[PDB]
Amino acid sequence: AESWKEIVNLLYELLASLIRGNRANCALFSTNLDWVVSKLDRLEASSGILEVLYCVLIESPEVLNIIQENHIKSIISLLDKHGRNHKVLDVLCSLCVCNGVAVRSNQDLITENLLPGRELLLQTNLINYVTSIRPNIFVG
Amino acid sequence: PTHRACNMFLESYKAAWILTEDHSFEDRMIDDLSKPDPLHQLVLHFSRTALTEKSKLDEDYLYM
Amino acid sequence: LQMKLPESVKLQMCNLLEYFCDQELQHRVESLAAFAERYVDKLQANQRSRDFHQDLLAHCGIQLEPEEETSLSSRLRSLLETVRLSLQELVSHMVVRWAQEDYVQSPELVRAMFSLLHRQYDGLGELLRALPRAYTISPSSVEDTMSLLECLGQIRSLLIVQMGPQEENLMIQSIGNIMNNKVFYQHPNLMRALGMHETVMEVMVNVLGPKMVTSCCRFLCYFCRISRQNQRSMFDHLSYLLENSG
Amino acid sequence: RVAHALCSHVDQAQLLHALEDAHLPGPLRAGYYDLLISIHLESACRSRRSMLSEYIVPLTPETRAITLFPPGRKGGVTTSLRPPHHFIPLEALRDKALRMLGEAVRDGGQH
């Protein structure tokens, strides 16, 4: 079983390496990919899945054209479940633009879903200076 | 305007007559040549880079 | 700013420098048009005093090379000297020299610098390209022209895309609508991107790359009908299109 | 959707403040400038540049006067016709920008 955990860990890396310079490798990735989003959202092996997903995302225009809302939501959910690794953002960037030209519809859906919550991200405001004094030395 | 069309024709004619000569490209090249990276050697290197590993090459004007 | 700096800074600087040269050419183009105007009227007057364009061209040719040259040939020679003719150019040369004395790293910057150097001293050639692309508008209309231009611009935007989401189709319908509107006519003289028509054709091919497609085909067909010469350009485009259809 | 993102937040005011603002993370400063340009937004600029590539000649006597002189040479009265931007702090943003460049040469003092 321990041996199995180690093997499981490597295999993902091999797949990513295999898909690294082949535009076509990007295509096998698409069907593999529906299956992949599902597998990808899983515990015990996050870096490998993330890398494979990233490769697929930057892999080809076709993969970008293909898309599942179920899939987008799942990815966003995975990102929320796991703290940002500078990785979730990378994945989002990957989803965006082919590019080429990014797909307005996909972009809009993803953007709304992430943005709508306002629970990302951080957020900023301007704030005047919260400020105070009292009089007296002491009272009480 | 009809006058506008006439003007356009006149312009085409001037351009037609206008090509002359005197280039000086040779002079500029000479200056660049006189002018440890190559003064132009850099240009040659740039050409090698554009390109390598590309599926196809597109008539970039600067190169040609 | 002659100050030594990180090179990328150099690329940004090169971009600004590039931006100016373009403004400068535009001025030259505008200048040619004015000279052409006045002289054209005087020439028309001479003709009145006593195909036609070809004859006029021949006369001009003899003058700057001769029939009815008149005193004005001296005037044309004078204008010609002016065209032949800057400080910006010298500055650009100095800039190129500084870039050279250092060794560029990163290709985009080098390419930019090189193209700039070329325009900067090759000159004239830029002028010829400019002459080829110049359209002259006569004192009338224009609002229609502006509208057509805006419509064309939207088309370009749709072309950049995106992957084509339909809304682009509605926009295309709107452009078709301007064409339906009759703004564009006197439009053979009016054409730009691969003719507005070939720009559109490229768009359609990428699109080929439904109802919108049919509309585009109709628009192309309509454009054809308009120019025999336009028809021939359309025809070369057409051979390409036929190949694509294959 | 970019306009909506801008409604975010960020904010026009936030962006103005950031531009006026000095210091902070390099990744952050660059990112902010980029975001503002994209959503401020530049897009219009890209469209304009594309239109701007060609040259359009107009026929108005004011336009007629133009012309250039050899004795003399200068940088920049244009008769060229470009569609008006559909469309911030426009001239105001511009003033702020002109100001920053000066601040910039000063910073771009030596060492």
The CA distance from D5 to the nearest CA of chain A, in Å, is: 8
Candidates D12, C182, C161, C169; CA nearest to A98 is: C161
Q: What angle do CA A102, D53, C24 make, to 5 degrees?
A: 140
> Do residues A103 and C163 make contact, with C-beta atoms less than 8 angstroms apart?
yes
Nearest one of C48, A79, C139, C118 to B62, comparing CA atoms: C118
- Two tokens at D110? 């030596």
Q: Tell me phi and psi for residue A109, to 5 degrees.
A: -60, -45
Q: How many CB atoms lie within 10 A of CB A48?
A: 18
CB atoms C160 and A65 under 8 Å: no
Q: What gap in Å lies between CA C11 and CA C105, rounded to an integer?
A: 11
Q: What was the experiment behind these coordinates?
A: cryo-EM
Residues C176, C169: contact at Cβ < 8 Å?
Answer: no
Shortest CA gap A135–chain C (Å): 55
Residues in chain B: 64
Report CB contact under 8 Å: D70, C82.
yes
Residues in chain A: 140
- Rounded CA-CA distance A8/C188 in Å is 66
- CB burial string C38-57: b at 16+ within 10 A, e below: ebbeebeeeeeeeeeeeebb
> CB–CB of C51/B14 below 8 Å?
no
Best of B17, B35, B44, B47 to mutate (most C CBs within 10 Å, chain C): B17
What residue spans of C73-194 are helical by DSSP H? 73-84, 87-100, 107-122, 125-133, 143-160, 167-181, 187-190
Chains touching chain C through at least 3 C-beta pairs below 8 angstroms are A, B, D
d(CA B37, CA A138): 76
Q: Which residues are within 8 A (CB) of A31 and not within 5 positions of it... i.e. 6 or more apart?
A: none
- Bridge partners for D56 per DSSP: C135
Q: Given phi > 0 = left and psi -120 to 50 = alpha, else beta, which region is B51?
A: beta
Characterize the bridge pairing of strands C135-136 and D56-57: parallel
Q: Which residues contact C71 (CB under 8 A, 6 or more apart)?
A: none
Q: Which two tokens stand for residue C92?
A: 């650009």
Q: B5-32: buried (b, 16+ CB within 10 Å) or exposed (e) per residue?
A: ebbbbbbebbbebbeeeeeeeeebeeeb
φ/ψ of D57, rounded to 5, equals -100, 130
- Residue D43: name the closest of D97, D6, D9 by CA: D6
- The helix or strand, by DSSP H or E, that contains position D56, with its residue range, turns out to be strand D56-57
Distance of CA C245 to CAs A118, A128, C206, Å? Answer: 49, 65, 13
Across the interface, do A101 and C162 touch by the CB < 8 Å criterion? yes
Which residue of C37, C57, C121 is in closest CB contact with B7? C37
Beta carbons of C175 and C155 less than 8 angstroms apart: yes
Measured between alpha carbons, how far is A74 from D30 in angstroms, rounded to an integer? 31
Q: Measure the CA–CA gap between C157 and A94, rounded to whole angstroms.
A: 22
Instruction: Extract the tokens encoding C88.
Output: 């910006």
Helix or strand holding residue C136 (H, E): strand C135-136
Q: Which residues contact C167 (CB under 8 A, 6 or more apart)?
A: A104
Token pair 């990328």 is found at: C8
Cross-strand partners of C135: D56
Question: Please, are residues B18 and C56 in contact by the beta-carbon 8 Å criterion?
Answer: no
Interface list for chain C against chain A, based on CB atoms closer than 8 Å: 160-163, 165, 167
- Assess contact for B19 and C84: CB atoms under 8 A: no
The DSSP bridge partners found for residue C136 are: D57
- Asked whether D85 and C164 are in contact (CB, 8 A), the reply is no
- Whether residue A71 contacts residue A82, with contact meaning beta carbons closer than 8 Å, is answered with no
DSSP state of D83: P
Whether the Cβ atoms of residue C136 and residue D57 lie closer than 8 Å to each other: yes
Nearest residue of B to residue D59 by CA position? B4
Number of inter-chain CB pairs under 8 A, A vs C: 20
CA–CA dist D49, D52 (Å, integer):
5
Give the Cα separation of C205 and D52 in Å (integer): 25
The angle at the Cα of C29, spanning B29 to C1, to the nearest 5 degrees, equals 55
Contact criterion met (CB below 8 Å) for A61 and C162: no
Give the three-class secondary structure for A120: coil
Question: Which of C161, C163, C171, C206 to mutate against chain A (most A CBs within 10 Å)?
Answer: C163
Contacts of A107 in chain D (CB under 8 A): 1
Taking a C-beta distance cutoff of 8 angstroms, is the pair C112, B62 a contact? no
* Separation CA D89–CA D99 (nearest Å): 14
